[PDB]
Design a protein around this ligand. Sequence first.
Ligand SMILES: *[C@@H]1O[C@H](CO)[C@@H](O[C@@H]2O[C@H](CO)[C@@H](O[C@@H]3O[C@H](CO[C@H]4O[C@H](CO)[C@@H](O)[C@H](O)[C@@H]4O)[C@@H](O)[C@H](O[C@H]4O[C@H](CO)[C@@H](O)[C@H](O)[C@@H]4O)[C@@H]3O)[C@H](O)[C@H]2NC(C)=O)[C@H](O)[C@H]1NC(C)=O
Ligand SMILES: *[C@@H]1O[C@H](CO)[C@@H](O[C@@H]2O[C@H](CO)[C@@H](O[C@@H]3O[C@H](CO[C@H]4O[C@H](CO)[C@@H](O)[C@H](O)[C@@H]4O)[C@@H](O)[C@H](O[C@H]4O[C@H](CO)[C@@H](O)[C@H](O)[C@@H]4O)[C@@H]3O)[C@H](O)[C@H]2NC(C)=O)[C@H](O)[C@H]1NC(C)=O
Ligand SMILES: *[C@@H]1O[C@H](CO[C@@H]2O[C@@H](C)[C@@H](O)[C@@H](O)[C@@H]2O)[C@@H](O[C@@H]2O[C@H](CO)[C@@H](O[C@@H]3O[C@H](CO)[C@@H](O)[C@H](O)[C@@H]3O)[C@H](O)[C@H]2NC(C)=O)[C@H](O)[C@H]1NC(C)=O
Ligand SMILES: *[C@@H]1O[C@H](CO[C@@H]2O[C@@H](C)[C@@H](O)[C@@H](O)[C@@H]2O)[C@@H](O[C@@H]2O[C@H](CO)[C@@H](O[C@@H]3O[C@H](CO)[C@@H](O)[C@H](O)[C@@H]3O)[C@H](O)[C@H]2NC(C)=O)[C@H](O)[C@H]1NC(C)=O
Ligand SMILES: *[C@@H]1O[C@H](CO)[C@@H](O[C@@H]2O[C@H](CO)[C@@H](O[C@@H]3O[C@H](CO)[C@@H](O)[C@H](O)[C@@H]3O)[C@H](O)[C@H]2NC(C)=O)[C@H](O)[C@H]1NC(C)=O
Ligand SMILES: *[C@@H]1O[C@H](CO)[C@@H](O[C@@H]2O[C@H](CO)[C@@H](O[C@@H]3O[C@H](CO)[C@@H](O)[C@H](O)[C@@H]3O)[C@H](O)[C@H]2NC(C)=O)[C@H](O)[C@H]1NC(C)=O
Ligand SMILES: *[C@@H]1O[C@H](CO)[C@@H](O[C@@H]2O[C@H](CO)[C@@H](O[C@@H]3O[C@H](CO)[C@@H](O)[C@H](O)[C@@H]3O)[C@H](O)[C@H]2NC(C)=O)[C@H](O)[C@H]1NC(C)=O
Ligand SMILES: *[C@@H]1O[C@H](CO)[C@@H](O[C@@H]2O[C@H](CO)[C@@H](O[C@@H]3O[C@H](CO)[C@@H](O)[C@H](O)[C@@H]3O)[C@H](O)[C@H]2NC(C)=O)[C@H](O)[C@H]1NC(C)=O
Ligand SMILES: *[C@@H]1O[C@H](CO)[C@@H](O[C@@H]2O[C@H](CO)[C@@H](O)[C@H](O)[C@H]2NC(C)=O)[C@H](O)[C@H]1NC(C)=O
Ligand SMILES: *[C@@H]1O[C@H](CO)[C@@H](O[C@@H]2O[C@H](CO)[C@@H](O)[C@H](O)[C@H]2NC(C)=O)[C@H](O)[C@H]1NC(C)=O
Ligand code: NAG
Ligand code: NAG
Ligand code: NAG
Ligand code: NAG
Ligand code: CA
Ligand code: CA
Ligand code: CL
Ligand code: CL
Ligand code: NA
Ligand code: NA
Ligand code: ZN
Ligand code: ZN
Ligand code: ZN
Ligand code: ZN
Lengths: 693, 693
Amino acid sequence: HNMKAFLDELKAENIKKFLYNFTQIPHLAGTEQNFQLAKQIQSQWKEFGLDSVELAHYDVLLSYPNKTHPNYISIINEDGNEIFNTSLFEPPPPGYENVSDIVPPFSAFSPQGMPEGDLVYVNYARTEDFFKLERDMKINCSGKIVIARYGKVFRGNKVKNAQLAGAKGVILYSDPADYFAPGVKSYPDGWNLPGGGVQRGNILNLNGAGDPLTPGYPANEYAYRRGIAEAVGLPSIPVHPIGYYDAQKLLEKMGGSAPPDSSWRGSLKVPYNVGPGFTGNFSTQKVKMHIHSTNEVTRIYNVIGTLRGAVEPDRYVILGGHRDSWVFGGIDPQSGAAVVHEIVRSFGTLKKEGWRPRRTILFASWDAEEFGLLGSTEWAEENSRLLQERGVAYINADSSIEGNYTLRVDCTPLMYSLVHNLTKELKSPDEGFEGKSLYESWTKKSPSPEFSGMPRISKLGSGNDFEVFFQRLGIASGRARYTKNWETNKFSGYPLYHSVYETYELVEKFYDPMFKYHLTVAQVRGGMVFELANSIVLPFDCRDYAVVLRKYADKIYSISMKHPQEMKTYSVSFDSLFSAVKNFTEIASKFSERLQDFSNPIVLRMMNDQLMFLERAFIDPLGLPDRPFYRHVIYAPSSHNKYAGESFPGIYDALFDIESKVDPSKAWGEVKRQIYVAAFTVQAAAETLSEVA
Amino acid sequence: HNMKAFLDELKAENIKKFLYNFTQIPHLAGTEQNFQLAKQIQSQWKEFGLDSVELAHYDVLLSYPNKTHPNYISIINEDGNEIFNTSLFEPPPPGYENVSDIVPPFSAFSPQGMPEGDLVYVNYARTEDFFKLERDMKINCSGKIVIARYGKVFRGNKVKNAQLAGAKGVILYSDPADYFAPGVKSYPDGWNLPGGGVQRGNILNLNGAGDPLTPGYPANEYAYRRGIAEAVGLPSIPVHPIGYYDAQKLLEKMGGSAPPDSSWRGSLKVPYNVGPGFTGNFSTQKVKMHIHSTNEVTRIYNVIGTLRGAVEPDRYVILGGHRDSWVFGGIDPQSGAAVVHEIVRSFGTLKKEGWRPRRTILFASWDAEEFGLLGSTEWAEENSRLLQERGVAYINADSSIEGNYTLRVDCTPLMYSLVHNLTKELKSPDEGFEGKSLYESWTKKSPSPEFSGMPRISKLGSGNDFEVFFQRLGIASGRARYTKNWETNKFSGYPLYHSVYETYELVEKFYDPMFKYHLTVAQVRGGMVFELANSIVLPFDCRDYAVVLRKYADKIYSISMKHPQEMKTYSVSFDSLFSAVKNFTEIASKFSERLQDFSNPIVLRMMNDQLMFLERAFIDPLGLPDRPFYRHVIYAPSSHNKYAGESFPGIYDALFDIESKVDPSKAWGEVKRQIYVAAFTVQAAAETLSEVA
Ligand SMILES: *[C@@H]1O[C@H](CO)[C@@H](O[C@@H]2O[C@H](CO)[C@@H](O[C@@H]3O[C@H](CO[C@H]4O[C@H](CO)[C@@H](O)[C@H](O)[C@@H]4O)[C@@H](O)[C@H](O[C@H]4O[C@H](CO)[C@@H](O)[C@H](O)[C@@H]4O)[C@@H]3O)[C@H](O)[C@H]2NC(C)=O)[C@H](O)[C@H]1NC(C)=O
Ligand SMILES: *[C@@H]1O[C@H](CO)[C@@H](O[C@@H]2O[C@H](CO)[C@@H](O[C@@H]3O[C@H](CO[C@H]4O[C@H](CO)[C@@H](O)[C@H](O)[C@@H]4O)[C@@H](O)[C@H](O[C@H]4O[C@H](CO)[C@@H](O)[C@H](O)[C@@H]4O)[C@@H]3O)[C@H](O)[C@H]2NC(C)=O)[C@H](O)[C@H]1NC(C)=O
Ligand SMILES: *[C@@H]1O[C@H](CO[C@@H]2O[C@@H](C)[C@@H](O)[C@@H](O)[C@@H]2O)[C@@H](O[C@@H]2O[C@H](CO)[C@@H](O[C@@H]3O[C@H](CO)[C@@H](O)[C@H](O)[C@@H]3O)[C@H](O)[C@H]2NC(C)=O)[C@H](O)[C@H]1NC(C)=O
Ligand SMILES: *[C@@H]1O[C@H](CO[C@@H]2O[C@@H](C)[C@@H](O)[C@@H](O)[C@@H]2O)[C@@H](O[C@@H]2O[C@H](CO)[C@@H](O[C@@H]3O[C@H](CO)[C@@H](O)[C@H](O)[C@@H]3O)[C@H](O)[C@H]2NC(C)=O)[C@H](O)[C@H]1NC(C)=O
Ligand SMILES: *[C@@H]1O[C@H](CO)[C@@H](O[C@@H]2O[C@H](CO)[C@@H](O[C@@H]3O[C@H](CO)[C@@H](O)[C@H](O)[C@@H]3O)[C@H](O)[C@H]2NC(C)=O)[C@H](O)[C@H]1NC(C)=O
Ligand SMILES: *[C@@H]1O[C@H](CO)[C@@H](O[C@@H]2O[C@H](CO)[C@@H](O[C@@H]3O[C@H](CO)[C@@H](O)[C@H](O)[C@@H]3O)[C@H](O)[C@H]2NC(C)=O)[C@H](O)[C@H]1NC(C)=O
Ligand SMILES: *[C@@H]1O[C@H](CO)[C@@H](O[C@@H]2O[C@H](CO)[C@@H](O[C@@H]3O[C@H](CO)[C@@H](O)[C@H](O)[C@@H]3O)[C@H](O)[C@H]2NC(C)=O)[C@H](O)[C@H]1NC(C)=O
Ligand SMILES: *[C@@H]1O[C@H](CO)[C@@H](O[C@@H]2O[C@H](CO)[C@@H](O[C@@H]3O[C@H](CO)[C@@H](O)[C@H](O)[C@@H]3O)[C@H](O)[C@H]2NC(C)=O)[C@H](O)[C@H]1NC(C)=O
Ligand SMILES: *[C@@H]1O[C@H](CO)[C@@H](O[C@@H]2O[C@H](CO)[C@@H](O)[C@H](O)[C@H]2NC(C)=O)[C@H](O)[C@H]1NC(C)=O
Ligand SMILES: *[C@@H]1O[C@H](CO)[C@@H](O[C@@H]2O[C@H](CO)[C@@H](O)[C@H](O)[C@H]2NC(C)=O)[C@H](O)[C@H]1NC(C)=O
Ligand SMILES: *[C@@H]1O[C@H](CO)[C@@H](O)[C@H](O)[C@H]1NC(C)=O
Ligand SMILES: *[C@@H]1O[C@H](CO)[C@@H](O)[C@H](O)[C@H]1NC(C)=O
Ligand SMILES: *[C@@H]1O[C@H](CO)[C@@H](O)[C@H](O)[C@H]1NC(C)=O
Ligand SMILES: *[C@@H]1O[C@H](CO)[C@@H](O)[C@H](O)[C@H]1NC(C)=O
Ligand SMILES: [Ca+2]
Ligand SMILES: [Ca+2]
Ligand SMILES: [Cl-]
Ligand SMILES: [Cl-]
Ligand code: NA
Ligand code: NA
Ligand SMILES: [Zn+2]
Ligand SMILES: [Zn+2]
Ligand SMILES: [Zn+2]
Ligand SMILES: [Zn+2]
């Protein structure tokens, strides 16, 4: 009854069976079908042997198209005749043409409206794309409809950026440059996005809030709800996504300015002119959106399973991933949910033979992740006091695969050593690495840029259910999946992401026929949970935080040093931050020696508490500026791209575009304030590792 | 080596000697003399046997009069001649007439200015006093100098209230009605305030912030400081305190309206007319303030002593009280600091014989309490992560006596049972209770209004160093001292409070000749620390929180029920709050049964963690509205009087004066929001006491 027993019990064939089972019908958040699946998972987790399995429900703001009043976009003429209309639905894949309740493509939480106007093309609608338009090209987006390609950044940031440029609507589309890999065929004959394929997805800017109506508090039965006008994170302009056949029709007539360079050009046979408006012959034609989606408070259901710890039942190791999907969820999330299902089954097999983990393991099937991480966040808001005093670690479990090339791990530095050690004990599933470790194949394919013989591990970003646990509550968090080769593949994510084409057959035919990558990911996620829940000493190495803190302090200093004159004028010093990082390094080294040197369960648990509370020490209860639910001082989601992690975010944002601020004394004063905050937090975290008295 | 050993070692004669030692010269915060005393205490605590004794220093905003440009108030005539001037200093007491560095009376943090105008008399400058003036009497304070009697509420609230009435200056004075007990003589021949006596004291409204320049973060060497204009809590109008000889001269000429009733009349031979301005003959005479005090960043020093725990060194029981005084500090704080000194000495005697407490005891000598709880708050800001994960309890130790009648205890419900049990084991020092317990004399003199055979224990308010620990960090807190009979004594506090007359001789001659009340208070404070630090199971009873929660829910409901029509119109229900309190009651009862029913140190410590984190569960990380450092949802300092505790403060303030709000739908919506917040927090606290898995 050890990790090997746990790991050997996991079966590729089981994951395949569960994935099939979870992907036959859509499981849209807030729908009857997703409630039925919740009840199925609850029943089976009970069957598998968990001690208790409960549903936790909340009533949250969701968004749905109007079934009898469809969303679409038109090219209109001067008479007001609609001469081109975008599609009302994606052509369903082979054998699914009779499946009902496929939600048509839409941007969740768009307001209603029917704006008409001239088109401006804004590339990826990134902060720098808008800088280039407004500052360099002198193109004014005010009162224009903007058309943006999907890719590079979270779509919620694209919409915020368009809104602040004064756009009156946004059209998102999938360019073949970003969603069509050269030499591969469109679904169903390969894994590429067809011209009729469209990416669904919410366009909120919640900054960690959870349910737009109840920031701070769970959306329970007696919750007081904000009115819509005071809701968190809703867009103020209509937004709608389209495929590249339709996008070609909207872009082909574009006039005004040429694209400023080749990074603005996708792969369609159009000029990619920025606009505004169409070329001479068509200059009186306009674009008109028709958006009739509604926001509605709707009940959602999380499944929470508990496997009580034998020795420390009041210490929680959490394995969590979502269950709601946009349509069939063939990759996102059911490739993860099937992996979780099999992990529960394996742990339950051990439990039935009389085993218990040392610490309590909690298993979660989250709802409404696609609509803003709503299920995980309301649950964490309800249980925040238990989680912050008892939460050892959170391992996420969304999509198990986004490619078939190598492992991808994003996690806290506290988990680096755990991950290196676990992957050295696992077999590589890769062709050409037969009989070699996962560590060896991963390190070869994804080398660390700093250290030879080590693999690359990314900072956690966001856009997934670990956000409340890590950046709000400061619980050590990690995620792992199989991924593509980013070096040779210039497309954003996997092409069929959030489309009707993301099916069981996509996975079985193209991504993972033998379910070996799925099994490898179940071993990594399950193996991490196993060690976190069973190791006598928590498997965190504080010294790994010291190394990265120095790297981040060097990076942020280098950013500031682009402005040597202002650093002189305003006496901007990084000395305190470096001092704190030096101290952290020294105290962590001493703590590590003591951890190696002690039959005393109180000393042990005292030191396990120091390990557990170390991630917690990086939380500032005041939050980051205007983002009160991003409280971790070392890591926040980038303010320009929710998917990407940023280090020392408070200082990073204080420095960003600082040369453009009208009051440099004020701007540099805020840089200095954020330096103080960061140095203090690092020192305070370091001091939690000092001898306690 | 038990509590009896500890308690028997404490000596009245030692406390007397220490009090003498601490009160020969002034120990104003930020002065050399108070730094010297800090070093003396550090040396002696080392000598007494503590494991380590450190100074923790901060650089905080303090306030001092200008030595070469004195503060005073004048009656001026139409020519501009100053025909009456208030005193520049209090007549020094017998034998102290040559003591240097007695700070003259002033209001700390007053801005500078020389405003001239007509006087309005505003009674105690309470919220209801201003309601009566503006709403009922139709007297406009805008551009007037207000004169207010000290008493009833914290002076910072008086100043805020005058400021919001549009006053251009405030004059505070001590009326004999409030500071002269009938039949007792003025200092030095009794304990009454003489006509030349004046009460010093800060006039900030910090709402828990600590140093005005660094809210959230310790005022360390590299701190970024707000500019003065953005500082927390500073008054915007000049303020100065005077004695009743001077007040008589300012009040005797008052004209305009008569006092509205007898509750507006003090004891001086003047009419107590509200004004504005003087009676006919003197109507062209005006009042002029001259305030030249300066705010200055100044270094302060806390002494922190550690007695490391034998079994749980990572669990902290804190005994803390301040050392800085306005002048000699004969009662405030040195009657407390002498008691702490003797407690350290007794614990140290046991330690030298080989004993250690189970948990770590921290001893604190705080600085700058008189200037806004600055020393305790900066230290807690620096050490917040250690305190919130390890802080068992905080026992305050300011003035040991404010009367000689009976015991006064204000504490969390979690300490009620501890206090009842300890006082049953202590001898009463009272005349007529020889051979009886302290519990018996206390209960007889101060009966609980709810329960026969029980003593009254007040809610914690504020205006002392427990504020950061309790209302910011949610560490279980208590205080105890000897007090007067409030039923038969209508004067506010003790008469010589914060005056030069508060001396060693005041205490030795009038309050506590035999030092028996001091010894009784050392036994209570020390006995509490002893039990908290040594009891195997933490000596908190969660069921006592359940009883008070019901009492507070009844009270707040009763307030709302004065508005039955609005409760109907806006569907205002308290059902959720009562449900949560019912649940808390049931879960606490079950938790208590389990606590009685378990050789297992993990179960024990798990349950000790549940006990320790129960106060912590009442913290809301978002704080109360516009008071981010008041985070406890059950108890905050009253928004009308910092000294008084308010229960369910969020709901209380939402309901306060609600009939006057211009938008009732908005106002009642906020009542409902605060009901939701309170119900949720109570339920979430209850759930920390549930089985953990
Ligand atoms: C004091 O403690 C008790 C626990 O003993 C709490 O009681 C809960 O109260 C809420 C009501 O506020 C109940 O919520 C209701 O749940 C129903 C489904 O519950 C099932 O599933 C749960 C676990 O997932 C089981 O524990 C439970 O036994 C059931 O099997 C919903 O169907 C209800 O919604 C319907 O009615 C309401 C009200 O009319 C409508 O608004 C809805 O639209 C809907 O039609 C409802 O949500 C909950 O079941 C109770 N729990 C238990 C264990 O009994 C109190 O909440 C607590 N007080 C506070 C302040 O927390
Ligand atoms: C990394 O870790 C080290 C600890 O090893 C910290 O070092 C401390 O650094 C501060 C400076 O920022 C030092 O502060 C100075 O303290 C002097 C008095 O210290 C005495 O008392 C303490 C305990 O109370 C003892 O530990 C210490 O050994 C001394 O006996 C002050 O006199 C200094 O102030 C004077 O100089 C400054 C600077 O020129 C002026 O602005 C002042 O006006 C004043 O004249 C100063 O405040 C502290 O002593 C150091 N501690 C130790 C134990 O060595 C770093 O702070 C830490 N990094 C971070 C970011 O926290
Ligand atoms: C693009 O789509 C518009 C609107 O069409 C409507 O909405 C879509 C989402 C689909 O669900 C359609 O099935 C749905 O009709 C088209 O413009 C519309 O054309 C229709 C038919 O010509 C007009 O309806 C009526 O026409 C008859 C003529 O006999 C009259 O008796 C009625 O009085 C009424 O006018 C309708 O007015 C018009 N609507 C708008 C908003 O313009 C458009 O033809 C189509 N363009 C294409 C396919 O190129
Ligand atoms: C109330 O106090 C004022 C001001 O007095 C000054 O401040 C106090 C706090 C004390 O420290 C005083 O010692 C200090 O002087 C008095 O008004 C002031 O009176 C003096 C003397 O009459 C004036 O100074 C000078 O007078 C000589 C006359 O020979 C001239 O040569 C000088 O040019 C100069 O005027 C001073 O102007 C005047 N100041 C003001 C602000 O009014 C006031 O007499 C006193 N009232 C009492 C005791 O009833
Ligand atoms: C995915 O897998 C689950 C679990 O195997 C399937 O649900 C299960 O379906 C069977 C057959 O429909 C159910 O048994 C039936 O019970 C009813 C009475 O409740 C009875 O009338 C039938 O004769 C039969 O015995 C079973 O209840 C159900 N189990 C759970 C836990 O829900 C599900 O159908 C699969 N979905 C797909 C799309 O393959
Ligand atoms: C990942 O695996 C590495 C390598 O096994 C782990 O580091 C090793 O941990 C062991 C156990 O603490 C260390 O052993 C100690 O050695 C010293 C003798 O120098 C002795 O004082 C102790 O009693 C103990 O035997 C070992 O030194 C150490 N090896 C290295 C190279 O660091 C690491 O802990 C694992 N990481 C996690 C998170 O589990
Ligand atoms: C309050 O009590 C303290 C502690 O008893 C007194 O401080 C102590 O004073 C004595 C006598 O001044 C000091 O001893 C002296 O040391 C110096 C050299 O440092 C030497 O020149 C003298 O001959 C003598 O031995 C002692 O250092 C000092 N102790 C401490 C811990 O500060 C203090 O004077 C008392 N204050 C009052 C107002 O009574
Ligand atoms: C203050 O003192 C009271 C009275 O001594 C303490 O309550 C008493 O606590 C003891 C020890 O837990 C209880 O004894 C238990 O009795 C049951 C038998 O019914 C048994 O199951 C247990 O093994 C244990 O012997 C006793 O019942 C209880 N008495 C009352 C009247 O409640 C109280 O705990 C003290 N408070 C603090 C904070 O220490
Ligand atoms: C979906 O859109 C339709 C419009 O086609 C909405 O139905 C109309 O709503 C208005 C205002 O409430 C009524 O006056 C009309 O009588 C309705 N028309 C029809 C044809 O039913 C409908 O409310 C929307 N549905 C949802 C669920 O929001
Ligand atoms: C105390 O008050 C005096 C005024 O009597 C201040 O001293 C004057 O300050 C101004 C402006 O800085 C100078 O121009 C004068 O020359 C000073 N006068 C004298 C007589 O010295 C003084 O700054 C104040 N002191 C403090 C510590 O704030
Ligand atoms: C862009 O256009 C709007 C409306 O026509 C105008 O008010 C705004 O000032 C313009 N902004 C710039 C930067 O040119
Ligand atoms: C799977 O791997 C092969 C071999 O490298 C590659 O050519 C193919 O494109 C991969 N499939 C997917 C879906 O990434
Ligand atoms: C009080 O007086 C001021 C200034 O003379 C005036 O502006 C203000 O409106 C008055 N307020 C009331 C309530 O009468
Ligand atoms: C001390 O107690 C006596 C007897 O009750 C009382 O008359 C006297 O006023 C008290 N002294 C003080 C300072 O309260
Ligand atoms: Ca919420
Ligand atoms: Ca501060
Ligand atoms: Cl994931
Ligand atoms: Cl006190
Ligand atoms: Na398919
Ligand atoms: Na005296
Ligand atoms: Zn997902
Ligand atoms: Zn997704
Ligand atoms: Zn005091
Ligand atoms: Zn005081």
